[PDB]
Design a protein around this nucleic acid. Structure first.
Length: 94
RNA sequence: GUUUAG
């Protein structure tokens, strides 16, 4: 709800425990789809696991996630997104 | 043996 959004922005403004925001590109919206999962189940699990705010890109726009949180947490979420994107490329590529 | 949540 709005409480979560407001508190998230307040945490960014303190720049204590949340201190990093990074763009994480993947090759295509099809990659985005498989990384996010149905109903966003996989990207929501990733946010929970890494304690990160993640913005999923809209289909048809640039397939680039934005990941925000503690530096080491953003690095873990970025690692998992990029590894997932490479996974789907390796197993789907013709 | 995966295919877009707020």
């Amino acid at each position: 709800g709005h409480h979560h959004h407001h508190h998230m922005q307040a945490a960014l403004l303190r720049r204590k425990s949340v201190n990093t925001t990074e763009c994480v590109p993947v090759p295509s919206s099809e990659h985005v789809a498989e990384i996010v999962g149905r109903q966003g189940c996989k990207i929501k699990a990733l946010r929970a696991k890494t304690n990160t705010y993640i913005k999923t890109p809209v289909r048809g726009e640039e397939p680039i996630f934005v990941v925000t949180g503690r530096k080491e947490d953003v690095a873990m979420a970025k690692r998992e997104i990029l590894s997932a994107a490479e996974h789907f490329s390796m197993i789907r590529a013709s």
